[PDB]
Write a protein that binds this ligand. Structure first.
Ligand code: ELK
Ligand code: NI
Length: 316
């Protein structure tokens, strides 16, 4: 019935935020494995869910154009001021990425080279619940398969928002929905494998053992290390997943998620080897050391620098 918008099709329905390309490149950000809910449904036009609402996003050299679909049978119109504030905080546009790039570049010749081709790679400020369960899905997995798992999970367990063309959009489920007695079996049938157990288990654990979604908001204001330890108590959440959540949803920019992907970048591009740890490959002690290595080098926004390199390492 209703259709995906472009800036030519329906130019009345869009609003804009002043934002240079040097501060934000959608195509680098929304497909770098931070969020798995965004798709380029037409060229330069990225559609995806954001807090029980669907958006489409496109950009020019110095403006970020955006439009909202409200789903319910309402009068279509441009984004409100509060909705633009939601999108401003999503991209964390208060933070000057230009000044961060040069700061990292001053102590990192490799970064300096990579920073030429890949500008405007910023961290999204994601919902903690959406981020947590998405990254439980990420273990031993790729961007394409994680996207699938998360799209099916939302169709099954989450509320319907709107259909645009063939794509039916669903919001992310609440914790109670994922914790039910049939949830593991449904999730296995939807193709998550062993991850299905961790999804249900952690949902159940956050409610019963920690008190529901407010606990994740407490971890936003708690210090990095306390939040990390707390997350590592959850089923299927280890250091890697806990750091991904810390970095991407709990405002801990120093968090450096360490698995095989930074190991490869650290070793090949920085000549890094674990010094204190004995064995030459990955281990919990060596992984921790590698996170400290990058924090020591780049400073308290170490994770934001990692994203730039990850985004670059994904592009050939
Ligand atoms: C953008 O910034 C971040 C993204 C994450 N995302 C993440 O770990 N995952 C798990 C696997 C990801 N991934 C692949 O499937 N192939 C990858 C690859 O091969 C060239 C290199 C790096 C990540 C890869 C997609 C989601 C973690 C930390 C940062 C700061
Ligand atoms: Ni070597």
């Amino acid at each position: 019935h209703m259709r995906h918008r472009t800036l030519s099709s329906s130019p009345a329905l869009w609003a804009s935020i002043p934002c240079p390309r040097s501060e934000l490149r959608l195509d680098l950000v929304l497909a770098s494995g931070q969020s798995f809910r965004w798709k380029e449904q037409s060229p330069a036009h990225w559609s995806g869910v954001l807090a029980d609402q669907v958006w489409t996003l496109t950009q020019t050299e110095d403006q970020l154009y955006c439009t909202v679909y409200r789903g319910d049978d309402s009068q279509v119109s441009r984004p409100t001021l509060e909705e633009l504030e939601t999108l401003h905080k999503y991209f964390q546009l208060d933070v000057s990425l230009a000044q961060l790039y040069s700061h990292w570049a001053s102590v990192d010749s490799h970064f300096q080279r990579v920073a030429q081709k890949f500008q405007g790679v910023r961290l999204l400020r994601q919902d903690p619940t959406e981020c947590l369960f998405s990254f439980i899905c990420s273990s031993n997995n790729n961007i394409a398969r994680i996207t699938g798992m998360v799209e099916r999970l939302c169709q099954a367990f989450g509320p319907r928002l709107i259909q645009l063309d063939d794509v039916t959009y669903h919001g992310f489920p609440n914790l109670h929905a994922l914790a039910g007695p049939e949830a593991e079996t449904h999730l296995r049938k939807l193709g998550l494998g062993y991850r299905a157990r961790y999804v249900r288990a952690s949902a159940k654990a956050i409610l019963e053992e920690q008190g529901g979604p407010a606990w994740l908001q407490q971890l936003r204001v708690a210090p990095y290390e306390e939040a990390h330890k707390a997350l590592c108590t959850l089923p299927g959440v280890g250091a890697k997943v806990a750091d991904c959540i810390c970095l991407m949803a709990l405002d801990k920019p120093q968090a450096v998620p360490v698995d095989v992907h930074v190991w490869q970048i650290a070793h090949r591009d920085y000549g890094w080897h674990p010094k204190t740890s004995q064995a030459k490959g990955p281990s919990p002690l060596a992984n921790k050391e590698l996170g400290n290595f990058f924090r020591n080098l780049w400073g308290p926004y170490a994770g934001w620098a990692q994203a730039v390199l990850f985004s670059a390492d994904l592009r050939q």
